[PDB]
Amino acid sequence: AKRTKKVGIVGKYGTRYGASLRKMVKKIEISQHAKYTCSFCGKTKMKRRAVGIWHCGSCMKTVAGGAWTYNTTSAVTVKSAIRRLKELKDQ
Amino acid sequence: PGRGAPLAKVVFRDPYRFKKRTELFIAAEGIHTGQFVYCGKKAQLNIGNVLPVGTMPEGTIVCCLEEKPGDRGKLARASGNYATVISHNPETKKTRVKLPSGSKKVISSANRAVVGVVAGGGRIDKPILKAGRAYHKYKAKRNCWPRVR
Amino acid sequence: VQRLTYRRRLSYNTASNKTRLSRTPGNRIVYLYTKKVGKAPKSACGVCPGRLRGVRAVRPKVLMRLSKTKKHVSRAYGGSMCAKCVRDRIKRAFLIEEQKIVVKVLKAQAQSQK
Amino acid sequence: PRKIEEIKDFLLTARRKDAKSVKIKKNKDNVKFKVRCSRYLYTLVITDKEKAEKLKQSLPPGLAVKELK
Amino acid sequence: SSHKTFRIKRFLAKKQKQNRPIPQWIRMKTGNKIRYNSKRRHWRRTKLGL
RNA sequence: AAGCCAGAGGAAACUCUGGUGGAGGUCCGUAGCGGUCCUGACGUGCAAAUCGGUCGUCCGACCUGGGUAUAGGGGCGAAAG
RNA sequence: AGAUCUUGGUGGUAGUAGCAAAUAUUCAAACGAGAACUUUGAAGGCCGAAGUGGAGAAGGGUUCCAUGUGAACAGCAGUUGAACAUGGGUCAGUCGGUCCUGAGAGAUGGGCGAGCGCCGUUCCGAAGGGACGGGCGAUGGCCUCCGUUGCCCUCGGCCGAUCGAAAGGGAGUCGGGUUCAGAUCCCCGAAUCCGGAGUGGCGGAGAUGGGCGCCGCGAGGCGUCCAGUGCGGUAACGCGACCGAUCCCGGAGAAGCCGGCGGGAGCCCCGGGGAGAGUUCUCUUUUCUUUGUGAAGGGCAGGGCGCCCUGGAAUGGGUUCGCCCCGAGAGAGGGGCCCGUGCCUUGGAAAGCGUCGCGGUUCCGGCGGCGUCCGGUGAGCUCUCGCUGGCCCUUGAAAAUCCGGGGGAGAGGGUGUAAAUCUCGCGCCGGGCCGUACCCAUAUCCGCAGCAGGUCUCCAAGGUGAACAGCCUCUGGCAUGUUGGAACAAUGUAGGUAAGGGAAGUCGGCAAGCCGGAUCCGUAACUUCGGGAUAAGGAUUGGCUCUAAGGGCUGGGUCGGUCGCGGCCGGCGCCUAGCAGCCGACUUAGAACUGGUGCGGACCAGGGGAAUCCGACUGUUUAAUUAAAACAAAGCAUCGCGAAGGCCCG
Ligand SMILES: [Mg+2]
Ligand SMILES: [Mg+2]
Ligand SMILES: [Mg+2]
Ligand SMILES: [Mg+2]
Ligand SMILES: [Mg+2]
Ligand SMILES: [Mg+2]
Ligand SMILES: [Mg+2]
Ligand SMILES: [Mg+2]
Ligand SMILES: [Mg+2]
Ligand SMILES: [Mg+2]
Ligand SMILES: [Mg+2]
Numbered sequence A: 001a002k003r004t005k006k007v008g009i010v011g012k013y014g015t016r017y018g019a020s021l022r023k024m025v026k027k028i029e030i031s032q033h034a035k036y037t038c039s040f041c042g043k044t045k046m047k048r049r050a051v052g053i054w055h056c057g058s059c060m061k062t063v064a065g066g067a068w069t070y071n072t073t074s075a076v077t078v079k080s081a082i083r084r085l086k087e088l089k090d091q
Numbered sequence B: 001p002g003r004g005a006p007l008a009k010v011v012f013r014d015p016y017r018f019k020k021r022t023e024l025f026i027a028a029e030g031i032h033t034g035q036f037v038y039c040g041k042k043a044q045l046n047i048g049n050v051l052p053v054g055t056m057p058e059g060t061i062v063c064c065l066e067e068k069p070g071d072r073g074k075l076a077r078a079s080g081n082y083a084t085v086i087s088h089n090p091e092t093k094k095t096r097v098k099l100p101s102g103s104k105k106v107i108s109s110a111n112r113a114v115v116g117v118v119a120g121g122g123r124i125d126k127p128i129l130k131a132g133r134a135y136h137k138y139k140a141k142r143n144c145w146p147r148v149r
Numbered sequence C: 001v002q003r004l005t006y007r008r009r010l011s012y013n014t015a016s017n018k019t020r021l022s023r024t025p026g027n028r029i030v031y032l033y034t035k036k037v038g039k040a041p042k043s044a045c046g047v048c049p050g051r052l053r054g055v056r057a058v059r060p061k062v063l064m065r066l067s068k069t070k071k072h073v074s075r076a077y078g079g080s081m082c083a084k085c086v087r088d089r090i091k092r093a094f095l096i097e098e099q100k101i102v103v104k105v106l107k108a109q110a111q112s113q114k
Numbered sequence D: 001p002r003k004i005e006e007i008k009d010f011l012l013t014a015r016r017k018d019a020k021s022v023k024i025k026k027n028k029d030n031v032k033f034k035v036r037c038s039r040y041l042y043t044l045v046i047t048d049k050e051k052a053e054k055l056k057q058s059l060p061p062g063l064a065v066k067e068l069k
Numbered sequence E: 001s002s003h004k005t006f007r008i009k010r011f012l013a014k015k016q017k018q019n020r021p022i023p024q025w026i027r028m029k030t031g032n033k034i035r036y037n038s039k040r041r042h043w044r045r046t047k048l049g050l
Numbered sequence F: 001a002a003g004c005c006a007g008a009g010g011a012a013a014c015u016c017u018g019g020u021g022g023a024g025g026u027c028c029g030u031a032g033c034g035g036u037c038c039u040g041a042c043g044u045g046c047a048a049a050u051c052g053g054u055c056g057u058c059c060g061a062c063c064u065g066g067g068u069a070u071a072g073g074g075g076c077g078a079a080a081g
Numbered sequence G: 001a002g003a004u005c006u007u008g009g010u011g012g013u014a015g016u017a018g019c020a021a022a023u024a025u026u027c028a029a030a031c032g033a034g035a036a037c038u039u040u041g042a043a044g045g046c047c048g049a050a051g052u053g054g055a056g057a058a059g060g061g062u063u064c065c066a067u068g069u070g071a072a073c074a075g076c077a078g079u080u081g082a083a084c085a086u087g088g089g090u091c092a093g094u095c096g097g098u099c100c101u102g103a104g105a106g107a108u109g110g111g112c113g114a115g116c117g118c119c120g121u122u123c124c125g126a127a128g129g130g131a132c133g134g135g136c137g138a139u140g141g142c143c144u145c146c147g148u149u150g151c152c153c154u155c156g157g158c159c160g161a162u163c164g165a166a167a168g169g170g171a172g173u174c175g176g177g178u179u180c181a182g183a184u185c186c187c188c189g190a191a192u193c194c195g196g197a198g199u200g201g202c203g204g205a206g207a208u209g210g211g212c213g214c215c216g217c218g219a220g221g222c223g224u225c226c227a228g229u230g231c232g233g234u235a236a237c238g239c240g241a242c243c244g245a246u247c248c249c250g251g252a253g254a255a256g257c258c259g260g261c262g263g264g265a266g267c268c269c270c271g272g273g274g275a276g277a278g279u280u281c282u283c284u285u286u287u288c289u290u291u292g293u294g295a296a297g298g299g300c301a302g303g304g305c306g307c308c309c310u311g312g313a314a315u316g317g318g319u320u321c322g323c324c325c326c327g328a329g330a331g332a333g334g335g336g337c338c339c340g341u342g343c344c345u346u347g348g349a350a351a352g353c354g355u356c357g358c359g360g361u362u363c364c365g366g367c368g369g370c371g372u373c374c375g376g377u378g379a380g381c382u383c384u385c386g387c388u389g390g391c392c393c394u395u396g397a398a399a400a401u402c403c404g405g406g407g408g409a410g411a412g413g414g415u416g417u418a419a420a421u422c423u424c425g426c427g428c429c430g431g432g433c434c435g436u437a438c439c440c441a442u443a444u445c446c447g448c449a450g451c452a453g454g455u456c457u458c459c460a461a462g463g464u465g466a467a468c469a470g471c472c473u474c475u476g477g478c479a480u481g482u483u484g485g486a487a488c489a490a491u492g493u494a495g496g497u498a499a500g501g502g503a504a505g506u507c508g509g510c511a512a513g514c515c516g517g518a519u520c521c522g523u524a525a526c527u528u529c530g531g532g533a534u535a536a537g538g539a540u541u542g543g544c545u546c547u548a549a550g551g552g553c554u555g556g557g558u559c560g561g562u563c564g565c566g567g568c569c570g571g572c573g574c575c576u577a578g579c580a581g582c583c584g585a586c587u588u589a590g591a592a593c594u595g596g597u598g599c600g601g602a603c604c605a606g607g608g609g610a611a612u613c614c615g616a617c618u619g620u621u622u623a624a625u626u627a628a629a630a631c632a633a634a635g636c637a638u639c640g641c642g643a644a645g646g647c648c649c650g
């Protein structure tokens, strides 16, 4: 059945810490414990090992990523910017 | 331990004797194991390469930037941070960068730096939520945590 | 039940004080101080997580008295690297050295002009 | 201890220079010839009663033939 | 304790040897003025320095 | 708690039910650690701070041995001089 | 004569307070001058496996153990003693230290310092004293020839002395016996690790085959030439060795906490067979005890695998308690490896144990007989091993030490019963130094003491039960905690009960009392939607006799058509709604009967509700009068600082 109406994963915290702090940590805890699909083998086994370290069980590929998400939106725009600058370094 | 930024073990070939050199970089976000990095003047713009800021485009952003030409990385080392190359001048061999605190600084064009932002992302976004989690965070760093007013 | 005692002067349940129960021919249970559990070598590739096969799994100083055959496998890198990651290296070394011949021939027809 | 299965290899272990004694122990089902070497105690077990008698009379000279009964 | 050093054990050896009554014939000596061993030490009454 | 299974209702959007799972500075409560109340006992005591009952916490900012470091206007202090 | 004078001695108090924490003693006998206290026996009890049991670390230091004394000490006594006296007792290659490094400590170089010195630990050092290798040599000497040895060439960063763990890392010893007191140390017996062998101890491997000329009837022989630093499997990998330096790469050492399952053992439980006891007023084929196989080899079960080969899967499938896995190769078939602490075997029964005897060496490892058996269960408990998960802004040592691989500088013999070499089998020699007794606590330690305090761990039986709870018991232990006897006043301390009332007592429901387990129902306001919540409230609960449901193993034939009273395949048949027999757990539900309505019968075991103030919560705090509203805390906000820097020590 549906066991919790709205708290979701942060039901482990009970009533503590305040509703908005539990809600803020809810989206982070969902992404932090999520299993992403590895872009090297295609298996959905890329999971967080430590903070900033994402490791794939299947292909044993470890990649440095975000603290909670597999890759942060900041570094995504950075990679596009660097690619744009490299193709602009030559003509 | 005591750091939010992951480290990278990178193995080079020693050029003067038959040996392997094990360096401990600071991981730029996006690097992975079994990936080649290239350090030198002639390296090209890729995430993880270590090349001088003088041989960079006018807007590239760097990860572990030296303060003095010749030492090792000293700036933008904490997780998610980065410097930004602003401008050069071939006269006087200087390069202006934007430090994470927004401070502009003039450094030599021979200062090396990783290309990219340092991994570890937005670690400060998650509320600690617990006196215990702060207790464990500072047990890895130094005896400073319970702060009496 | 017949309760037991330690047979040495180490009275704490540390890692070097593990015991197992043994029934002597005198029909009494006594402690027997076990050796530690050894592990087979990990692969030198540092990628795959399994340990090597065909190699006796003992403490490091037991290898000093083991036979040579018990400590390795009859193959190149045997006893130091897994078979799977050796085949990859044989293919990789061959194919990349083929690539160098390709770029050498490609520049060979590129230097036909002056 | 090392267990000896056949007869002729028990002979030259018994005639080895470091062999000190031979003990013959008769059970309810077999006879055991135990030769005491420097390192091991080699034991040969014979179920046949007549085979044990022949081997006992054929034991090498200059060696203890101690019986355990 | 059971685990002791050689230096400690030898120290206790001297203390044990000299914790004994005076010989009986000492009192017969001329100009004696000694009645009993006044340096007697009991293990429970007083403890050793070490 | 998340995750997972099956079933049902719905024109869809989506919802509901029963299991499974075993989270948590989670609750009751031992050992441990602590020390609320009786302002109980004792108060030339068993004790230069203990005892009885009742109690707080009991997977964690948990309890603990040993090895180390910090020394007097100095140390150390989740702070009471 | 004074100074709360100094020192010493002595009174009254006073034969007084007191010798009251943890249930408990009694009978007979012995020794003895003497017995509440000693010892033995009988009984009644307690600790009740988280012990009042059996062993250790720290600490003590002879308290250990015999014999003797009865002065003093053991707050009564004592024939007893942890007292006194006299003797005796601690046996190691494999148990520790010793070795390694850890947090750290600490020299030298250097710097400072009036100076003893102290800063610093890689920093501002010419910091390698070593190496198989090759050469020049002295032929030191069983001068054939390999060991010496001086020098030279080449190579050589642990880049830092040294110390730092009797709980970390760390090769390799177990079974039985023995003493008044010691044993993994002695003795008996089985092993094993490291080191060594100069003349090299023995085997085995390397390694001993082909081509051609001939002899010889062929077989088998002679001469020449050529290889020969092993071999097998498609693979995983295997076989008994399997040449190899400097150098390089890697592994082991070497890893947190928590959850859930599975394998193995030990214990516990049940059914029988022995042996010995117990009860027998009656019953009870009954109740109790006991019923081994060490290390190290070999073999086989079993457990695991992120190992291999075939093959190519959607109508997706396999599979777990949970998960999870698959065209990056599922399912299936066939293999490989690791662990093997389980079983068999060598050890091994000769020993040990239980019983029944027979002799004696004041006091025999005496001798002898018989046995040391077959089974079944399990969410059981404790270890251990494995698999798979979860948690971390926490990611959970280091170094000695040992090993594998890459590479191929070199070495070795000219086909000899060969050479260099060997991580293979067996054989030979050695392992020095220090510790080792005992207590480890309501009496061997600290607390002035035989002090209700404090002091680090290991093992862990039956019943009830959710349970390592409480309560009763077995193994083991003890004598009620520094005295006993007689009485049963007051006051007390600890524990109960109390008619009718029910907080009227009191500053205040202080204290006590009520409630309490489990099952079935039933649960409000409010709320951060998680909670409140065991809300509140109600019913039931015993004993006995049954009835249901929840499982596991085997076997399912139509037949001699023939014979190796049974099978090589099939003429020969339709469990295909599944049956047959055997075995075995607890649990749940339903019913009848029955008791003076008593039944969570002891034990264990929440009083509840409505509000107000404060602190969010969990945590912490004035050891010895304050546990709080105080501190901390996450969260929020501000400040300084880009290293020639901020803050701080000196
Ligand atoms: Mg504060
Ligand atoms: Mg056994
Ligand atoms: Mg004392
Ligand atoms: Mg809690
Ligand atoms: Mg609680
Ligand atoms: Mg208080
Ligand atoms: Mg009081
Ligand atoms: Mg006077
Ligand atoms: Mg006067
Ligand atoms: Mg009196
Ligand atoms: Mg009294």
Ligand SMILES: [Mg+2]
Pocket: G048
């Ligand atoms: Mg009792």
Ligand SMILES: [Mg+2]
Pocket: none
């Ligand atoms: Mg004890």
Ligand SMILES: [Mg+2]
Pocket: none
């Ligand atoms: Mg004694």
Ligand SMILES: [Mg+2]
Pocket: none
């Ligand atoms: Mg007395």
Ligand SMILES: [Mg+2]
Pocket: none
């Ligand atoms: Mg004495």
Ligand SMILES: [Mg+2]
Pocket: G128, G157
């Ligand atoms: Mg050096």
Ligand SMILES: [Mg+2]
Pocket: none
């Ligand atoms: Mg040392």
Ligand SMILES: [Mg+2]
Pocket: C016
């Ligand atoms: Mg140790």
Ligand SMILES: [Mg+2]
Pocket: none
């Ligand atoms: Mg003893």
Ligand SMILES: [Mg+2]
Pocket: G293
């Ligand atoms: Mg056996």
Ligand SMILES: [Mg+2]
Pocket: none
């Ligand atoms: Mg398969």
Ligand SMILES: [Mg+2]
Pocket: none
């Ligand atoms: Mg026997």
Ligand SMILES: [Mg+2]
Pocket: none
């Ligand atoms: Mg002892």
Ligand SMILES: [Mg+2]
Pocket: G442
């Ligand atoms: Mg005491």
Ligand SMILES: [Mg+2]
Pocket: none
């Ligand atoms: Mg003192």
Ligand SMILES: [Mg+2]
Pocket: G480
């Ligand atoms: Mg009493």
